[PDB]
Design a protein around this ligand. Structure first.
Ligand SMILES: [Ca+2]
Length: 223
């Protein structure tokens, strides 16, 4: 997260870190057995780490659970990044408490202008690399579809939205992918792609989760 602030220990209790020997992508806990992340975060050998704040220090509230099944969206296109979403089933149910909680899926999509919270352990610099060990948060609005499309002409589908600041300075970045975008208590986006991080007129592009809720509900009930 570039230009964000330290969230504070377990203030984003639905945030998960996907780990394969090291943090590589975020994800969101949607109920005690299921996590959703970005499809481009797919790997076999994923351990889901819940209750994390410093990902390098065992602070006591963590739960580390292996994934037993990953399901990438049936229409994910790695060339366009259209339908960049996947579901991960945990080997055993997470214990839900104050530090570890699920986020609700949306009943409706959000509109341009809605303020959202984006969080992750990704790169904190627009030029250079500095990885934080504690969770960073960013408050950012959903931008209009024409702002989005003008920044990335011919690259935005109806399953994407932009959020951020066209002036730059504040954005998600590498290491944040698959992480949550929550607006009014609902999971509305998944950190997916962008051009560089926090550059002027290059806002972050997010998977629009409200288009996938019946696929999510149906898939988890049958797996
Ligand atoms: Ca930790």
């Amino acid at each position: 997260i570039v230009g964000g602030y330290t969230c504070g220990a377990n203030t984003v209790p639905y945030q998960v870190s996907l780990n394969s020997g090291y943090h590589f992508c975020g994800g969101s806990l949607i109920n005690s057995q299921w996590v959703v992340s970005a499809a481009h975060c797919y790997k076999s050998g994923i351990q889901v780490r819940l209750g994390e704040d410093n990902i390098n220090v065992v602070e006591g509230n963590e739960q580390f659970i292996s994934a037993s099944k990953s399901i990438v969206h049936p229409s994910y296109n790695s060339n366009t990044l259209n339908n960049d979403i996947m579901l991960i089933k945990l080997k055993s149910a997470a214990s839900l408490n104050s530090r570890v909680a699920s986020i609700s899926l949306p009943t409706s999509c959000a509109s341009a202008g809605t303020q959202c919270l984006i969080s992750g352990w990704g790169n904190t610099k627009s030029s250079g690399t500095s990885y934080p060990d504690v969770l960073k948060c960013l408050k950012a609005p959903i931008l209009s579809d024409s702002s989005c499309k003008s920044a990335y002409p011919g690259q935005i589908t109806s399953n994407m939205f932009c959020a951020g600041y066209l002036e730059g300075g504040k954005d998600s970045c590498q290491g944040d992918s698959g992480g949550p975008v929550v607006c009014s208590g609902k999971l509305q986006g998944i950190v997916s792609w962008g051009s560089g991080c926090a550059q002027k007129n290059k806002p972050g592009v997010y998977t629009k989760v409200c288009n996938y809720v019946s696929w999510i509900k149906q898939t988890i009930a049958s797996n």
